[PDB]
């Protein structure tokens, strides 16, 4: 409720929706970057291994990109140490292009912003 309310105030400047398993796996594998550095000195680094994942989470037994996907899809007990550990994805512009960034995805006229629900997988894998 809290984050949905705080995101509704920013809805006209974003588009969001259901990620689904294949898309979360694609995002983590080919666009996943991780903060390996020390606290407040994070030094963004691509995953490329499981050593840093284990170093930050091995004592908390969620070591491995296997486990990170196993955990990000079904929001289990560790989302703090996954989302915050994961660097913000820097996506490419869409391959085929946006429809209208100025208008909502939900208006009858073509538009982009809003909740695409399950329709964001195509946009993500087009932007990836």
């Amino acid at each position: 409720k809290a984050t949905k309310e705080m995101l509704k105030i920013v809805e006209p400047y974003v588009t969001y929706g259901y990620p689904t398993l294949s898309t979360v796996r694609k995002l983590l594998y080919k666009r996943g970057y991780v903060r390996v550095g020390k606290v407040r000195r994070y030094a963004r680094k691509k995953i490329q291994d499981n050593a840093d994942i284990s170093k930050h989470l091995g004592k908390y037994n969620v070591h491995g990109i296997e486990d990170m996907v196993y955990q990000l899809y079904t929001c289990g007990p560790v989302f703090k140490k996954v989302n915050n550990f994961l660097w913000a994805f820097k996506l490419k512009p869409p391959r085929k292009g946006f429809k209208a960034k100025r208008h909502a995805f939900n208006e009858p006229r073509p538009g982009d912003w809003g909740n695409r629900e399950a329709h964001i997988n195509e946009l993500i894998n087009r932007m990836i």
Binding site: F105, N106, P108, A118
Partner: protein, 180 residues
């Protein structure tokens, strides 16, 4: 399959109810079926109509199952009926609608282009309600009766439209407009 001709409408049916409250221990369940560009777009339109006709929204409505109950045969040929309501720049006006195509998906959508071309009514101003099936003889429209006649014909004097392959700029001589 040709993507240029096709629109982007499919079937869906999603069932839910308003939230059971302490005041309303056993609320009733309700449903309604429309098609639009997307399932999310149709859900938003359904919630808008729910807010306009009754008092409920996402804050007081939930859904408890989702399915895609497609048509019996999408390759059939039909004649259905809906009810149109729209607004102009100075008022509001209503009527009915019926048209022929293969399936409800495009049966909903062939109307918007005509409305925009004639009355400049943007899609945010038209409301379509209560899809059912119409008869073929009961139609009092001029054009639609000859659609299911026993036998009919007319020529094909439309202008040619060639490919980008063969739309060659410089021609040996002037083409004609008879064909066949």
């Amino acid at each position: 399959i040709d993507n240029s001709l096709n629109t982007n409408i499919h079937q869906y049916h999603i069932v839910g109810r308003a939230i059971p409250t302490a005041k309303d221990k056993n609320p009733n369940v309700y449903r309604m079926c429309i098609f639009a560009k997307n399932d999310t777009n149709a859900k938003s339109r359904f919630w808008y109509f729910m807010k306009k006709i009754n008092k409920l929204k996402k804050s007081n409505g939930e859904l408890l199952a989702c399915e895609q109950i497609k048509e019996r045969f999408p390759l059939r040929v039909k004649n259905y009926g809906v009810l149109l309501r729209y607004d102009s720049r100075t008022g509001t006006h209503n009527m009915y609608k019926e048209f022929r195509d293969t399936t409800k998906e495009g049966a909903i959508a062939q109307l918007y282009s005509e409305m925009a071309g004639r009355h400049r009514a943007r899609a945010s101003s038209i409301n379509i309600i209560r899809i059912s099936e119409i008869s073929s003889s009961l139609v009092r429209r001029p054009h639609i009766k000859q659609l299911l006649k026993r036998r009919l014909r007319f020529p094909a004097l439309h202008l040619p439209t060639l490919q980008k392959e063969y739309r060659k700029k410089f021609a040996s001589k002037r083409p004609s407009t008879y064909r066949m």
